[PDB]
RNA sequence: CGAAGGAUUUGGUGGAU
């Protein structure tokens, strides 16, 4: 066993995540009226996920 | 005037730097690439044709070039001078692909295989002092297929892998070739004997090799072959090349290349048996410019990269499998670097000012994060990734 | 340019230590001049570089840009000990007399070390020394009493007094070589300069100005001012025969070249 | 996908998608269900290619009714994404039509595939 | 960080400016206990960063200085918010400055006959224009390139004013560089032409004709290439010297051209007819040339610690000067 | 008032225009500078001018 | 919107006309309606006239 | 909109994070929930030092009283740890942070957090929290066994937990729950356990 | 042609006029 093996193991372990782009949250304003705060945060998380 | 809730306010006051230092991080940034250009590899002794193939030595700091000039020029890449170690002109033998080979058991054994649109292959033994001190080169010609001449018309497309003869536990190299009708011919690297042959339906377009470790000192070599339609075959070369898996590339059509990365491969060869690792990535090119990326850990691609609008001519991963470099020979400056597993193309590099020409060869150094890109004008340009 | 970044013969002249770059990592190798060794020390970091290379009577002292000095044993092929200065400024020069070991940083701070004890004895900075790229310790008896230091001009400094003693008008460009040919005659050369100024330590007057055909890279002296060999930037070797005997400016007597049979 | 019929086999799908690529280069290809509908009305279609995985499949089932009335061959391919890339666009395509041109440079290839589709029907 | 300067704003706003040896200048709001803005790398860290930064008494202007031979002024513009101006603070804005070379100049030249300006090159890879009048004006030549980091330090420079404002009128040679770059006084920017030695050598000499139509480049390999300033196109190439060409000069009449090299020969050419009028060998290698056009005399600094004056008309040594004890760095004609 | 080697120079802060210069070069480099209305105190070696 | 709405009408209409086992719910139409509304929202959110930006005059400052 | 411009994002750090601190301070749960939305988005857009993340935890947990804020906060804490991609990404929480977290989130709560199938990716935080338990709480070694079963952790993360548990056996007395944790690792991926033992002892 | 993009417009300051 060697350190570079551990480094490549750590590299393999890391997983992708959904990046935030310019046009990700623009639609929020469309459905921003009469919406509960918790639901708004849940939608933000859903887009982020 | 003269856990606490105000912790966040205080820490902001302490520092005006809020981006975490990338020096500590072992994972390269997703969208920003720190890349610096160095001296060209071919500057010292220019080539007279397009750079058809590029290959770094597995351990030594050498770069091998080939082309229709029929010369195997070997350069000592230091990044500042890049002088030429040796040259070997092969009369009447255009070079479509060349590669170093180091025996996995006998580290002292080094060898170069070169092939072209001919019915023979050349092997150049670099062991001991043959590379530099010797006045003459020890060259052998492989021209015998042992009854299978009809399947093979040219040695031009070949790759070299390691096969472990399980019943004896001995490990030796194999030379893989492309046949006329889905035929893959496998030869012994040293003796040249025909070991086995693999057949797929349709026209063979490209193939690649994947290693799956079994136990201490045991590993199996898998041959992955793909058809123009996109059907992928996986043969087990340790069991007479019998099919073990069949699947199709989702949305695949006009496939052109296939590659694996994240473990041992021709670009990232091993030095001992324990260094053998399984590849976690698989990329499938196409004429349309799409590159479906698959996670080896019917399959559904993780991403469908579509930045290039021309046929994919080179697909290659970094030795650690964190960058995928996809390039096309159809047009100029058709090269992109894709960050894995984010599958996001780097934006800062290449630029309109980056000189690449008609990219026709790409190579990642086994270590040091150097990238060499050859073009149709015969120039091998060298870049360094500062993260490595 | 030459692939060999730095080189230095051993005092006997039988072994040459050279540092070269493999991909992005510098590797240090040693070869036997009188007559192949495949074993090189490899610097594990791309940033790390060797600034100084000095033989020890079988160990070699390697100055590094990290701000620390490595003691390397060629036989074992491992760094036996590392001398670390408190600061992080690159070492500009290194010189040795027995146990004495003197280095200078980019911050113009002198340091003293003992090989036997592996300890930092003293560190000091002398005013009127705005740069320091070269350090030479005079062969005075068996102990160090004064030091020759040059950046663009040359200065003599007394260790006990911790002050300059004399100043020599040096070259315009940074000083590249500051070897002491004999007592009270030491030669000096500069980057991209074809002229070597021989100065008198006690008097301070330019005894002679030796001139090479092209820019000078390395300098070797034979015996006691008997003969001086200078490697020119064009790749030729010029020899000065008895340079310490019109009189002001002298030219090399013998020129040596290497050319292949092809040309 | 029982409604999709006839569904071309793996061997025939590659031949169809091969002709589609050539037609796209020669500007002899009309992409989309709506243009494919038009080509039937104008009687300039050699044959129609449809994607079986389109969901809901119904948005292209009107073409068989038009094709049978006009006596134009039609065939289903398994994947719309594959049809899209063959067409030469960055978006999935559910239907396509090969425009008639007796002076085309790929005329022999179109008729060969057209005959195979006719046998299939 | 290490504090190098401190100052308070006396304009009625509780602002504290903190200068650091790293070259940073930070501003804090004492009332609000917050950072307003930070100015990064205003002065070089290698030269002590911000040696001194002072708020002027009762004004929003702060003067900054350092060891890099630069003095800058920054202004805090009025807040652009009608209310809560203290919260909305405009960042400091560059106002004016003066400066100079950060390292000793390597080459100098007088720009014009009137002697109102001088060109200066330094080891900091910059070419500067300094006025010799009380205005003390100083301007760095723009290095932004034409299309059809700083350049290496200048080792040689030539300038003419016959065609100033028409096309490029300066030729500069760079260290370890195989071509020479052109500049323009009137635009105060780098030119659009590059002159190559064409023999795989480094540029050791640069010269210009009085008419301003020709530029001469001497390579380290002994070849003299002649370009045209207007089009930057190679016209002729003389090959007499085998060692480096250390000096090129042309007479006011554009007829007789003189060259010298480390090989010790002084070559005389007929520029109009392109013929070798004569060749004169000196005892020692020649290091530099200065040509006096009115008298047609040129002096040569020889390796033997002498200055040899030669008349181009008769191609003979007229005066030889002795006395220097070491290498002659530079010399000029009255 | 800015020190220049062995001499000091006075600039108008409104325009950074040079106003005055020291008539003579001090025997030693100036170490400190203090300015008070029309009088500037220059310090060098063991003398204050 | 007419071009977009007509295209989505054909999708919904063809689902209705050629269905062997359509549920009487309008689910395809409802999802098509959401697409047209989303197209309308972004299209209507567009501002043809260029937005003017905060003018920042570097007004001359003379000391007092 | 400023995602591409990294420099502009850095200038946005002092302002919006400061606002988040003020919003967290407000006793209104809606303000705290709003602060959570800003923090989670900003962490994804721009990586930050772990110290900033840890300081953000202290502010979030200091004034966490509303149940709705507690639910949103727990999701926020896990997401911030996901953004962390340096050495110490899964290191144990500080003692003060560990004590604060358990008080505002009982261990039974996180088991319910892990119980639901639609849980977000939280392996780095759980790896950090798991190492926090072993260092500071000995009675909780049993709850660790349940936590590992509920959530799959990345291979290197499992190695780090094994690495600490080896030290626990040497220092802490052998326990049925402690050996049971080992036996759990014996059952799953036996070979990797030997590598940790080989490297450590 | 081409080392970490290219074109057009524009505010302010500094220097001459």
Q: List chain D domain ranges.
A: 1-121
CA distance G42 to chain A (A): 8
DSSP state of B282: E
User: By the 8 A CB rule, do B104 and B117 touch?
Assistant: no
- Chain C residue nearest residue E287, CA to CA: C194
DSSP 8-state class, residue D26:
T
Question: Scanning every residue of chain B, which has its alpha carbon at the shortest distance from the alpha carbon of C38?
Answer: B60
The continuous run of DSSP H or E covering D37 comes out as helix D33-42
H33 contacts in chain A (CB < 8 Å): 37-38, 41
A18 part of contact set with chain B, CB < 8 Å: no
Separation of alpha carbons B14 and E290, rounded Å: 61
By the CB < 8 Å criterion, does A7 face chain B? yes
Query: In the complex, which nucleotide's C1' lies nearest to the CA atom of residue E138?
Result: I15
| Chain B to chain D Cβ contacts (< 8 Å) | 32
Name residue, tokens 């930050």.
H48
CA of E95 to C1' of I12 (A): 9
Please report how the helices H155-171 and H176-187 are oriented relative to each other, as an axis angle in degrees rounded to 10. Answer: 150
Q: How far is A20 from chain H (nearest CA, A)?
A: 6
* Residue in F closest to E100 by C-alpha: F4
B249 touches strand I (CB under 7 A): no
How, if at all, do strands C249-251 and C206-211 pair?
A: parallel
**Is B342 within 8 Å of A11 when comparing Cβ atoms?**
no
Q: Is the CB of B387 under 7 A from strand I?
A: no
Is B13 in Cβ contact with E34 (below 8 Å)?
A: yes
Task: Read off the tokens for B96.
Answer: 């479509």
Q: What are phi and psi of B202, to 5 degrees?
A: 85, 180
Q: What is the CATH number of domain D1-121?
A: 3.30.1330.30
Angle at H164 between CA H159 and CA H168, to 5 degrees: 140
Nearest to B61 among C1, C22, C46 (CB): C22
The reply to whether the CB atom of residue B333 sits less than 7 A from any atom in nucleic acid chain I is yes
Distance of E13 CA from I15 C1′ (whole Å) = 34
- Is A41 in Cβ contact with H72 (below 8 Å)? yes
Mapping DSSP to helix (H, G, I), strand (E, B) and coil, where does residue B70 land?
coil
Which residue bears the tokens 């719309």?
A: D80
Q: Phi, psi (5° rounding) for residue H127?
A: -60, -45
User: CB–CB of D14 and B229 under 8 A?
Assistant: yes
The rounded distance, in Å, linking the Cα atoms of H22 and B87 is 70
Return the sign of the alpha-carbon dihedral for residues D33, D38, D41, D47.
negative
- DSSP assigned state of H148: H
Q: Count of CB atoms within 10 A of residue H116's CB?
A: 9
Per-residue CA distances from C244 to C215, C241, C247, E165, G10 (Å): 21, 9, 10, 56, 104
At residue C182, φ and ψ (nearest 5 deg) are: -145, -170
Instruction: Measure, in angstroms, how far nucleotide I13 C1' is from residue G58 CA.
Output: 9
Task: Record the resolution, in angstroms.
Answer: 3.0
A-to-G residue pairs, Cβ atoms closer than 8 angstroms: 5
Task: Tell me phi and psi for residue B235, to 5 degrees.
Answer: -100, 145
Residues of A in contact with G38 (CB under 8 A): 27, 30
I strand bases under 7 Å from protein CB: 1-7, 11-16
**Cβ density class G4-21: b for 16+ within 10 Å, e for less:** eeeebeebbebbeebeee
Number of neighbours of residue C86 by Cβ within 10 angstroms: 10
CB B323 within 8 A of CB B340: yes
Distance E57 CA to I15 C1' (A): 28
CA torsion sign for D99, D105, D109, D114 is: positive
| E308–chain F nearest CA distance, Å | 37
Instruction: Name the minimum distance, in Å, from the CA of C165 to any CA of chain E.
Output: 23
CB C16 within 8 A of CB C8: yes
Using a CB-CB cut-off of 8 Å, the residues of chain F touching G63 are: 13-14
Instruction: Return the partners of chain B (3 or more C-beta pairs < 8 Å).
Output: A, C, D, E, H
Q: Is the CB of F17 under 7 A from strand I?
A: yes
What does R_g of chain G's alpha carbons equal in angstroms? 25
Token match 């031009």: residue? B156
Q: Report the distance from CA of residue B229 to the C1' of nucleotide I17 in Å, as an integer.
A: 75
88-127 of H, contacting B, C-beta below 8 A: 96-97, 100
CA distance H53 to chain B (A): 9
Q: How far is the CA of G48 from the C1' of I7 (A)?
A: 24
Chains contacting G (3+ CB pairs below 8 angstroms) = A, D, E, F
List chains touching F (3+ CB pairs under 8 A): E, G
Q: Quick check: B341 and A14 CB within 8 A?
A: yes
Q: Which nucleotide is nearest to B351 (CA to C1')?
A: I5
**CA end-to-end distance (rounded Å), chain A:** 36
The helix (H) or strand (E) run that includes residue H50 is helix H50-62
Find the closest chain A residue to H153 by CA distance: A13
Among E98, B215, G56, CA closest to F12: E98
Which residues in chain B touch residue D82, judged by CB atoms under 8 angstroms apart?
Answer: 230, 251-253
Smallest CA–C1' separation from B38: which nucleotide? I3
**Chain B residue with minimal CA distance to E31?**
B1
Instruction: List, in sequence order, every residue forming a beta bridge with E206; answer none if it has no partner.
Output: E217
| Residue G53 beta carbon within 7 A of nucleic strand I | no
Q: Residue-wise over A7-41: b if at least 16 C-beta within 10 A, else e?
A: ebebbbebeebeeeeeebeeeeeeeeeeeebeebb
Question: Which residue of chain B is at minimal alpha-carbon distance from H24?
Answer: B5
Q: Is the CB of B39 under 7 A from strand I?
A: no
> Which helix (H) or strand (E) covers residue D101, if one does?
none
Q: Which of C184, C102, C108 is nearest to C143 (CA)?
A: C102
- Among D81, D23, D87, D89, which Cα is nearest to D52's? D81
Q: C18 in contact with B at a CB cutoff of 8 Å? A: no
Distance from CA of B312 to the nearest CA of D (A): 14
Strands across the sheet containing E234-239: E203-208, E214-219, E223-228, E234-239
The chain G residues in contact with chain F (CB within 8 A) are 62-63
Chain E residues closer than 8 Å to F17 by CB: 135-136
Q: How many CB pairs under 8 A join E and G?
A: 15
Does the CB of B349 fall within 7 Å of any strand I atom?
Answer: yes
Nearest residue of F to residue G63 by CA position?
Answer: F14
Sequence-ordered list of residues with C-beta below 8 angstroms from that of A37, at least 6 positions apart, any chain: H30, H33, H34, H68
H-run or E-run covering E179: strand E179-184
If you compute the radius of gyration of chain D from its CA atoms, what whole number of angstroms results? 13
CA of E147 to C1' of I2 (A): 11
- One DSSP character per residue, H69-106 reads HHHHHHHHHHHHHHH--STTTTPPPPHHHHHHHHHHS-
Rounded Cα distance, E21 and E27, in Å = 15
- Which among C130, C231, C141 has a CA at the least distance from the CA of C183? C141
Distance CA H200, CA H168 (A): 12
Q: How far is CA C90 from the centre of its chain?
A: 15
Q: Does G30 touch chain D (CB under 8 A)?
A: no
CB contact under 8 A, D88 and B228: no
DSSP character for C261? S
C27 near C19, Cβ under 8 Å?
A: yes
Token readout for B183 is 């035929």
**Do the beta carbons of residue D64 and residue D76 sit within 8 Å?**
no
The spacing between the Cα labelled CA in E305 and the C1' in I7, in angstroms, equals: 57
């Amino acid at each position: 066993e060697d350190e570079e093996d551990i480094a490549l193991e750590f590299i393999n372990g890391e997983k992708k995540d959904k990046l935030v782009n310019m046009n990700s949250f623009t639609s929020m304003f469309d459905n921003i009226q009469n919406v509960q705060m918790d639901t708004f945060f849940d939608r933000v998380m859903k887009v982020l996920t | 005037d003269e856990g606490d809730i105000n912790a966040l306010t205080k820490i902001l006051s302490t520092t005006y730097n809020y981006k975490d230092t990338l020096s500590n991080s072992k994972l390269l940034p997703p969208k920003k690439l720190d890349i610096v250009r160095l001296k060209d590899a071919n500057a010292s002794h220019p080539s007279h044709s397009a750079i058809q193939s590029l290959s770094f030595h597995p351990s030594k700091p050498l770069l091998l070039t080939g082309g229709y000039d029929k010369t195997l020029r070997i350069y000592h890449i230091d990044g500042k001078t890049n002088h030429l170690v040796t040259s070997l002109h092969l009369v009447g033998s255009p070079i479509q692909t060349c590669t170093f080979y180091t025996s996995l058991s006998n580290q002292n054994q080094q060898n170069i295989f070169t092939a072209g649109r001919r019915r023979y292959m050349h092997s150049w033994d670099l062991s001991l002092e043959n590379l530099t001190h010797s006045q003459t080169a020890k060259i052998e010609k492989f021209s015998r297929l042992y009854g299978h001449e009809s399947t093979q018309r040219s040695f031009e497309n070949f790759k070299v892998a390691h096969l472990q003869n399980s019943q004896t536990n001995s490990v030796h190299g194999i030379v893989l070739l492309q046949g006329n009708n889905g035929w893959i011919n496998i030869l012994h690297s040293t003796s040249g004997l025909w070991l086995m042959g693999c057949k797929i339906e349709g026209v063979i377009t490209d193939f690649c090799i994947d290693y799956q470790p079994i136990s201490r000192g045991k590993f199996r070599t898998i041959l992955i072959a793909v058809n123009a339609y996109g059907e992928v075959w996986e043969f087990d070369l340790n069991k007479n090349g019998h099919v073990i898996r069949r699947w199709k590339d989702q949305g695949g059509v006009g496939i052109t290349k296939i590659q694996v990365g994240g473990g041992t491969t021709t670009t990232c060869p091993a030095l001992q048996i324990s260094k053998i690792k399984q590849n976690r990535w698989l990329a499938v090119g196409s004429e349309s410019g799409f590159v479906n990326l698959y996670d080896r850990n019917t399959p559904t691609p993780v991403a469908a990269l579509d930045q290039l609008t021309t046929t994919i001519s080179n697909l290659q991963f970094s030795p650690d499998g964190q960058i995928l470099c996809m390039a096309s020979r159809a047009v100029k400056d058709a090269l992109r670097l894709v960050h894995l597993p984010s599958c996001s193309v780097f934006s800062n590099w290449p630029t309109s000012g980056t000189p690449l020409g008609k990219v026709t060869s790409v190579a990642f150094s086994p270590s040091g994060g150097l990238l060499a890109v050859g073009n149709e004008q015969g120039k091998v340009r060298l870049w360094k990734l500062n993260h490595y | 340019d030459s692939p060999v970044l730095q080189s230095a013969y051993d005092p006997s002249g039988q072994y040459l230590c050279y540092v070269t770059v493999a991909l992005d990592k510098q590797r240090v190798g040693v070869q036997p001049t009188q007559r192949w060794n495949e074993n090189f020390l490899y610097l594990e970091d791309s940033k790390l570089k060797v600034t100084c290379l000095k033989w020890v009577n079988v160990a070699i002292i390697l100055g590094m840009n990290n701000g620390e000095i490595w003691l390397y044993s060629v036989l074992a092929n491992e760094v036996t000990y590392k001398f670390t200065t408190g600061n992080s400024y690159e070492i500009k020069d290194i010189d040795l007399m027995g146990n004495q070991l003197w280095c200078i940083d980019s911050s113009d701070a002198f340091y003293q070390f003992d090989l036997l004890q592996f300890k930092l004895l003293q560190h000091f900075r002398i005013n009127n020394c705005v740069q320091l790229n070269k350090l030479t310790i005079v062969p005075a008896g068996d102990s160090v009493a004064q030091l020759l230091v040059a950046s663009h001009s040359i200065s003599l400094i007394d260790i006990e007094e911790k002050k300059v003693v004399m100043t020599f008008p040096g070259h315009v460009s940074p000083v590249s070589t500051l070897q002491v040919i004999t007592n009270e005659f030491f030669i000096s050369g500069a980057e991209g300069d074809r002229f070597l100024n021989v100065y008198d330590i006690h008097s301070g007057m330019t005894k002679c100005v030796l001139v090479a055909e092209s820019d000078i890279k390395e300098l070797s002296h034979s015996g006691q001012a008997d003969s001086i060999a200078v490697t020119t930037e064009d790749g030729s070797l010029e020899i000065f025969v008895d340079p310490l005997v019109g009189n002001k400016s002298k030219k090399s007597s013998k020129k040596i070249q290497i050319v292949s049979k092809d040309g | 996908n029982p409604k999709a019929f006839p569904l071309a086999d793996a061997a025939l799908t590659q031949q169809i998608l091969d002709v589609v690529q050539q037609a796209a280069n020669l500007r002899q290809l009309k992409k989309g269900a709506n243009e494919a509908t038009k080509t039937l009305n104008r009687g300039i279609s050699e044959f129609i290619i449809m994607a079986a995985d389109c969901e809901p499949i119904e948005i292209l089932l009107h073409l068989p009714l038009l094709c049978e009335d006009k006596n134009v061959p039609y065939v289903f391919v398994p994947s719309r994404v594959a049809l899209g890339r063959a067409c030469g666009v960055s978006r999935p395509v559910i239907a396509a039509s090969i425009t008639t041109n007796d002076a085309s440079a790929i005329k022999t290839q179109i008729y060969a595939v057209k005959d195979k589709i006719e046998t299939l029907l | 960080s290490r504090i190098s300067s401190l100052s308070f704003r006396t304009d009625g706003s509780s602002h504290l400016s903190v200068g650091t040896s790293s070259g940073d200048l930070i501003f804090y709001d004492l009332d609000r206990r917050s950072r307003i803005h930070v100015l990064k790398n205003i002065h070089r860290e290698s030269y002590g960063g911000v040696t001194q930064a002072t708020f002027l008494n009762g004004q929003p202007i702060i003067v900054t200085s350092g060891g890099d031979n630069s003095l800058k002024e920054y202004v805090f513009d009025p807040s652009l918010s009608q209310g809560s101006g203290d919260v909305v603070v405009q960042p400091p804005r560059y106002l004016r400055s003066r400066g100079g070379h950060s390292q000793p100049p390597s080459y100098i030249a007088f720009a014009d006959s009137q002697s109102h300006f001088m060109l200066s090159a330094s080891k900091d890879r910059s070419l500067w224009s300094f006025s010799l009048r009380k205005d003390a004006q100083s301007q760095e030549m723009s290095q932004r390139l034409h299309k059809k980091s700083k350049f290496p330090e200048i080792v040689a420079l030539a300038i003419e004013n016959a065609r100033i404002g028409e096309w490029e009128n300066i030729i500069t040679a760079h260290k370890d560089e195989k071509f020479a770059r052109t500049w323009d006084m009137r635009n105060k920017r780098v030119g659009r032409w590059t002159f190559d030695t064409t023999d795989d050598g480094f540029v050791k000499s640069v010269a210009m004709s009085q008419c301003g139509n020709f530029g001469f480049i001497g390579s380290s390999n002994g070849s003299i290439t002649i370009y045209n300033m207007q089009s930057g196109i190679l016209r002729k190439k003389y090959k007499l010297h085998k060692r480096a060409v250390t000096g090129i000069s042309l007479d006011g009449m554009n007829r007789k051209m003189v060259s010298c090299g480390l090989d010790g020969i002084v070559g005389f050419y007929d520029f109009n007819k392109s013929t070798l009028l004569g060749k004169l060998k000196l005892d020692a290698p020649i290091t530099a040339m200065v040509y006096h056009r009115s008298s047609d005399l040129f002096a040569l600094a020889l390796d033997d610690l002498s200055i040899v004056v030669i008349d181009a008309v008769t191609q003979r040594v007229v005066r030889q000067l002795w006395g220097h004890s070491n290498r002659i760095t530079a010399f000029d004609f009255s | 008032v800015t020190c220049v080697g062995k001499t000091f120079q006075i600039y108008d802060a409104n325009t950074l225009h040079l106003l005055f210069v020291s008539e003579k070069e001090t025997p030693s480099s100036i170490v400190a500078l203090s300015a008070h209305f029309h009088y500037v105190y220059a310090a060098y070696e063991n003398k204050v001018g | 919107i007419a071009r977009v709405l007509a295209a989505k009408a054909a999708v919904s209409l063809r689902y209705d006309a050629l269905a062997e086992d359509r549920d009487d719910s309008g689910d395809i139409g409802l999802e098509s309606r959401a697409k047209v509304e989303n197209r309308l929202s972004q299209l209507e959110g567009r501002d043809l006239r260029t937005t003017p930006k905060v003018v920042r005059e570097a007004k001359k400052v003379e000391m007092t | 909109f400023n995602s591409n411009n990294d420099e502009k994002l850095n200038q946005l750090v002092p302002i919006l994070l400061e606002i988040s601190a003020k919003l967290l301070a407000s006793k209104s749960k809606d303000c705290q929930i709003a602060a959570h939305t800003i923090l989670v988005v900003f962490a994804t857009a721009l990586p930050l030092k772990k110290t900033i993340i840890l300081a953000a935890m202290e502010t979030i947990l200091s004034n966490l009283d509303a149940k709705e804020a507690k639910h949103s906060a727990l999701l926020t804490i896990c997401k911030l740890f996901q953004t962390l991609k340096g050495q110490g990404n899964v290191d144990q929480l500080p003692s003060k942070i560990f004590k604060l977290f358990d008080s505002k989130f009982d261990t039974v709560s996180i088991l319910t957090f892990l119980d639901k199938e639609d849980k977000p990716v939280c392996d780095k935080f759980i790896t950090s929290y798991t190492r926090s338990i072993a260092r500071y709480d000995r009675s909780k070694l049993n709850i660790i066994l349940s936590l590992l079963k509920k959530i799959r952790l990345e291979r290197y993360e499992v190695r780090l937990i094994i690495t600490d548990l080896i030290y626990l056996s040497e220092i802490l007395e052998d326990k049925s729950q402690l050996v049971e944790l080992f036996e759990y690792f014996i059952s799953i991926n036996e070979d990797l356990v030997l590598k940790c033992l080989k490297s450590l002892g």
